[PDB]
Amino acid sequence: AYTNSFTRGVYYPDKVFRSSVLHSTQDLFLPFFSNVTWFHAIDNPVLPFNDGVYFASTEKSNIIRGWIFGTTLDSKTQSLLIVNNATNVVIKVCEFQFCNDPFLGVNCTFEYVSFKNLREFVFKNIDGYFKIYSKHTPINLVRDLPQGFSALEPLVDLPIGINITRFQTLLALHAAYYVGYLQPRTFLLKYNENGTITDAVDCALDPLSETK
Amino acid sequence: CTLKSFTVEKGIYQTSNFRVQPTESIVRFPNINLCPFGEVFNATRFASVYAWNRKRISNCVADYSVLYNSASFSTFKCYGVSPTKLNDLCFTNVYADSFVIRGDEVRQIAPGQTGKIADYNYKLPDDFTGCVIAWNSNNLDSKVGGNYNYLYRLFRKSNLKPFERDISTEIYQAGSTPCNGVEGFNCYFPLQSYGFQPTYGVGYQPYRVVVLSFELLHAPATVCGPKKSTNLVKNKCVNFNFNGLTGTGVLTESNKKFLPFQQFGRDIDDTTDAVRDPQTLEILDITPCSFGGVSVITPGTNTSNQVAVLYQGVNCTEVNVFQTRAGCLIGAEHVNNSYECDIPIGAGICASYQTSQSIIAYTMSLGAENSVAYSNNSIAIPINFTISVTTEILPVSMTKTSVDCTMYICGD
Amino acid sequence: TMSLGAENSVAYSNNSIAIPINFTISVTTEILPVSMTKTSVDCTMYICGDSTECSNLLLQYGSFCTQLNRALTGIAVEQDKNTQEVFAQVKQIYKTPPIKDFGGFNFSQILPDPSKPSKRSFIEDLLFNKVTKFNGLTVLPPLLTDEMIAQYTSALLAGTITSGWTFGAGAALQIPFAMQMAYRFNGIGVTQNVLYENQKLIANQFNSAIGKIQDSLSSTASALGKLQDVVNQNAQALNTLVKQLSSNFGAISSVLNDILARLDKVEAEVQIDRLITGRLQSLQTYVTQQLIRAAEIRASANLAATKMSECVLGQSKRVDFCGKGYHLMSFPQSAPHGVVFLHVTYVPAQEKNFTTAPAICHDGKAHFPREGVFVSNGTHWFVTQRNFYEPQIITTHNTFVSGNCDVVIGIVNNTVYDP
Amino acid sequence: ALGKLQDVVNQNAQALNTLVKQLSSNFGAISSVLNDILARLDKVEAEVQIDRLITGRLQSLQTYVTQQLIRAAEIRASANLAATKMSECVLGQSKRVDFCGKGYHLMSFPQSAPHGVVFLHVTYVPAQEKNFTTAPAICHDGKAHFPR
Amino acid sequence: GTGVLTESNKKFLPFQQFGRDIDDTTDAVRDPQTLEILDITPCSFGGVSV
């Protein structure tokens, strides 16, 4: 199944405050009006990672509660794992033989801890440092991602030094999610008076955007 | 001295620039761990060069002089930083890469180099920023009968990219022979052991290397020199250093809504405009120290050596004293009237001499006011005339210079 | 493919003339830039960020730096000269009487308005409302403030209304405005009784034409485009000069303090000379482009100063110089970094075609018109002036004799009256 | 203060004095005297220093020619105005206000000067106003009469 | 250097060995073997064109 991403997947490109300015930046972004793949949770196939992932989901009580990243995923290499249990967020890199599809039942190379809504995330791995950005918003469309704008805020940056080519989400067991791939693009970003990014242009989408 | 003359004519002359000097130097760093470089440089055993070991260094204060002062090191080459400066700096993270290597081969551990270690064991980026430390390790790493535990890659299909690493033992192909996973004519195992014996000559002896890569960014620093912080100062011209960001200016509290992850702030033209204090976490706006120009206002020295000064664009609190819209004006008797302009100052202000022994400054006269005697049936007609001769001067040409470009540049 | 205009085979014939039965007074707006912002840039403060380790390298280039400040100072001084050449043409600050008895013409939108905190006219406030980094750079104020430029465009206009041509030639000599306009009609070759016989209509056409200037300037964004373009070009040139401080030029970094904070002197000087080399070419490029751009503004200030003298202090005979038609008069309005001229013009209208002949035969003499043309409506022959149809009986006063009937091609037979 | 001609002498003299001074500067070489580099360093040792002199001496000569091309364009704009005042003020009688002195123009006379020209513009200026009552027209036998 | 040498009236003070031009180069000298002062002038008066 497929959907148009519209203008979703913008994030703050660096840790610098700016305001009332049209900044321009080149980075891995989800292209405007890209064609992105839709999945129902009634499954979690292994998916390619390419250069980075935009991931989004819509479930009534959060069924998507983690991810595996790596190349084999099964911990026969250093495999990154992320899970949240509504008390903590728990993050690991491990080679111990945990299960091949470890749904949340309702070497420790690194470790760290900390349709009612749309939940959005961006995952990227430049220099082997695993970066996570996110947003949550009360929007209630079931089929497609909602046409509109919001900027994803950086949560986490893990200096793991590790290779990834595939990923797989983890489900709560005893609801839908969308996946799209980042590409190296130039953007123009509109920073508001209060420093929020409130609009953007994809400078390679079409001749009008290249003019802007 | 500006005009290269002992006599100066009536006018306004931009002689010098003025700027406010900084009063004090402010140093700010996180209140954070004397750094575990000892756990790298004094480790009992180092890696094989084909399988080099990287340690992340972070969240620490590092006295690099413990390294660069020591006689224990045979080489300390450094690129994009000079090693005596490292105690003043701050970095996001540092990566320490460590191994044993044959002593002759150490010359390959630099940016832009080529040779079997650089090509197939450990490749630096050619835009590296970091230091390479090396020492003779013969008494640590050589042994009687030879130490075989240390190896290098002799063969690969293709060279390493910067900080690429390769573990594989699979058979190399040196010709047309298909190797099928076994040695033979032009088919060989890709790794060789050094076998270090203490009898070997210095170029054949084992050496230890540590390479420090500095993660220099405008992101928050987690590795820093031992340099101590000062207290903070506000609303005053100071020199400053935040996490190794040196600058000069006035520091002031501000309303800028930094989001919780944001560390620095910037202007429309991409200058640093604000920071958050690494200890206090307050947002401080930065504005440059005040400056402008020193336009000296003079009648001719053939009339008088008395002078006035305009601190151009400056406010008089930052330098009789009179605040014009053009800047702070300093002299005496800057008195309220109007006259035609003698010397211009700007924004309708002009200045002129009184021989009562003073330079006036005044708002300029545009001319005498005249209500014309108009009414709808009155005309004025001239009873008489005057023939007037008006001299107009115009430039028409200028001196026909020419320059021999070869004789000017090279002098024959 | 673009169209050059409507095609027109005009109805030429060897004996046909067209003469306008009526006229339009038209007022049209001409806008000229006169000056530009007086920037300056301290070459040492721009290049070296005011760092002594860099300044002692910059001295190796010698007098390269002081001649950039000489150039920008010459450009800045001539902006005050350009503003003076245009507005300061009037020797005394004339003002109008309190009563506005100008013969039915209504200058209330053109003259000053003391309701405003700066005493600009109604139309000058439309103009001033439509026209729209801190380290090396500096912006100097102009010598004349807009409140002083508005006193010149007030005097340079109260003289025109009360005294016409005369306040340019010497002392202002008062004349009633309805009579001033009669000698401006007389200057375009229209007999002065055409004004006095049509004075209400002519004043209504003038007042209505000034009303339409409020609407054009209130509505239309491109109207002041020549002034806004001069503001935009200088802003785009400064933005380029400042953004070039971020350029790397082949150093380890573009931030001069971050070179000095990482490298020791003999290693740092090699990086700093790359920044000095690029920052000096970055500033020489700006000063060269400003010296050329200032010559375009000066050539416009010299034009604006001659439209001021010839159109405002006079009655121009030069075609299309003071607007498109037979020029009568012009009024200056100030604008941000420019001047605006309201060119009052006579335009002929409601054309009618008549039979014509070069000369008229009587007693074998040929008669030629002193002023104007012969015309016929069929049954009769008349003299008229050229630019407005006023027919008169042909007499030995409105005609002069030469030669005889045999000489002239297309001569015609009609009796000339002896009064 | 009759300075328009002396200001053109001063600018061209100041531009050449600056062009000659620029030979004394090092531009980052060991010396500004080219013979003292050649008389101290052996060929390939010296060419690295001499290229700093050549780069700075090109850039300072090319700065002079560029500013002279701009100064020459304003002298030509002034020579076109002087050529126009010769034609319209000397060879004729101008009707153009303030082009040709102030007051109504009668004549001009051209005098030569160093690098320039001087026009002695002769003008009529009206000089003793008197007030009078005035009217557009005279009514006589019901006819309106207007003045020629 | 290279030029035309002419013995000249520029009365150097006893400590002064040279006289100088605006590019800092030599305009006049004292001879290393005599108290003679020489003006130095350029050949062709600074070359010439053809």
Ligand SMILES: *[C@@H]1O[C@H](CO)[C@@H](O[C@@H]2O[C@H](CO)[C@@H](O)[C@H](O)[C@H]2NC(C)=O)[C@H](O)[C@H]1NC(C)=O
């Ligand atoms: C022409 O008439 C006017 C108005 O009656 C005269 O102007 C006034 O003259 C007196 C005495 O010199 C002044 O105090 C007033 O200030 C003048 N009023 C104005 C409005 O200017 C004028 O003197 C008369 N004569 C001439 C030769 O112009």
Ligand SMILES: *[C@@H]1O[C@H](CO)[C@@H](O[C@@H]2O[C@H](CO)[C@@H](O)[C@H](O)[C@H]2NC(C)=O)[C@H](O)[C@H]1NC(C)=O
């Ligand atoms: C001259 O023109 C002005 C502006 O068109 C006229 O002023 C208006 O007059 C009316 C009379 O009822 C007032 O209510 C308005 O407030 C005035 N201003 C505007 C902007 O409309 C003026 O009447 C005209 N005539 C004269 C003799 O001045």
Ligand SMILES: *[C@@H]1O[C@H](CO)[C@@H](O[C@@H]2O[C@H](CO)[C@@H](O)[C@H](O)[C@H]2NC(C)=O)[C@H](O)[C@H]1NC(C)=O
């Ligand atoms: C000359 O043209 C003017 C318009 O430019 C004509 O004036 C208008 O005439 C109509 C009809 O009489 C009136 O309703 C308007 O009010 C008039 N306009 C003005 C501004 O007064 C005029 O009639 C024409 N005259 C001739 C002789 O053709």
Ligand SMILES: *[C@@H]1O[C@H](CO)[C@@H](O[C@@H]2O[C@H](CO)[C@@H](O)[C@H](O)[C@H]2NC(C)=O)[C@H](O)[C@H]1NC(C)=O
């Ligand atoms: C003004 O122009 C009209 C239009 O051309 C003339 O009318 C023509 O007159 C000729 C005879 O002279 C006829 O042959 C045509 O048929 C007429 N009509 C057209 C439509 O051309 C008129 O004669 C001209 N008036 C004067 C006084 O010259």
Ligand SMILES: *[C@@H]1O[C@H](CO)[C@@H](O[C@@H]2O[C@H](CO)[C@@H](O)[C@H](O)[C@H]2NC(C)=O)[C@H](O)[C@H]1NC(C)=O
């Ligand atoms: C144009 O032609 C007409 C022809 O009718 C002229 O008017 C006639 O003139 C005679 C002598 O003055 C009178 O007896 C007639 O009664 C007039 N007729 C009309 C209809 O008025 C007329 O004079 C000529 N055109 C002009 C502008 O005068």
Ligand SMILES: *[C@@H]1O[C@H](CO)[C@@H](O[C@@H]2O[C@H](CO)[C@@H](O)[C@H](O)[C@H]2NC(C)=O)[C@H](O)[C@H]1NC(C)=O
């Ligand atoms: C204007 O042009 C017409 C032709 O377009 C001339 O008319 C001719 O006049 C001669 C007079 O001897 C006659 O022989 C012809 O038969 C006429 N031709 C036509 C077609 O009418 C007319 O004469 C010209 N006017 C003048 C003053 O030369």
Ligand SMILES: *[C@@H]1O[C@H](CO)[C@@H](O[C@@H]2O[C@H](CO)[C@@H](O)[C@H](O)[C@H]2NC(C)=O)[C@H](O)[C@H]1NC(C)=O
């Ligand atoms: C204009 O009128 C004159 C007479 O005033 C005409 O000339 C005469 O024409 C007749 C008939 O051709 C001749 O017999 C006479 O010899 C001519 N001369 C004189 C002095 O009478 C002339 O033809 C007329 N021309 C036009 C164009 O109407």
Ligand SMILES: *[C@@H]1O[C@H](CO)[C@@H](O)[C@H](O)[C@H]1NC(C)=O
């Ligand atoms: C997205 O791309 C796939 C490519 O096979 C296509 O089948 C699908 O129809 C596309 N969706 C849209 C909305 O264009």
Ligand SMILES: *[C@@H]1O[C@H](CO)[C@@H](O)[C@H](O)[C@H]1NC(C)=O
């Ligand atoms: C990442 O792993 C894949 C095997 O899954 C390998 O082909 C690829 O070369 C690796 N990339 C890097 C940069 O190590």
Ligand SMILES: *[C@@H]1O[C@H](CO)[C@@H](O)[C@H](O)[C@H]1NC(C)=O
């Ligand atoms: C941990 O790493 C070693 C060496 O890479 C490997 O032999 C071992 O199997 C890993 N641990 C697990 C639990 O697989």
Ligand SMILES: *[C@@H]1O[C@H](CO)[C@@H](O)[C@H](O)[C@H]1NC(C)=O
């Ligand atoms: C910006 O902040 C102000 C002050 O808190 C607030 O009133 C306003 O709604 C904010 N606007 C935006 C676009 O964020």
Ligand SMILES: *[C@@H]1O[C@H](CO)[C@@H](O)[C@H](O)[C@H]1NC(C)=O
């Ligand atoms: C390594 O060992 C020496 C032994 O004298 C000690 O002084 C030093 O502090 C240790 N650490 C480093 C980084 O040299």
Ligand SMILES: *[C@@H]1O[C@H](CO)[C@@H](O)[C@H](O)[C@H]1NC(C)=O
């Ligand atoms: C040091 O760190 C703590 C972290 O809680 C901070 O609250 C404190 O203000 C800092 N110390 C000083 C003296 O500011």
Ligand SMILES: *[C@@H]1O[C@H](CO)[C@@H](O)[C@H](O)[C@H]1NC(C)=O
């Ligand atoms: C100095 O003053 C005197 C008297 O005013 C005058 O004659 C002389 O020319 C002046 N000299 C200069 C160099 O201005």
Ligand SMILES: *[C@@H]1O[C@H](CO)[C@@H](O)[C@H](O)[C@H]1NC(C)=O
């Ligand atoms: C001058 O500076 C003082 C102190 O900063 C301030 O109170 C005053 O308003 C300033 N005035 C002007 C005209 O800048």
Ligand SMILES: *[C@@H]1O[C@H](CO)[C@@H](O)[C@H](O)[C@H]1NC(C)=O
């Ligand atoms: C002060 O000077 C102004 C002009 O600058 C003038 O209008 C005003 O009358 C003067 N005040 C006094 C008391 O003289």
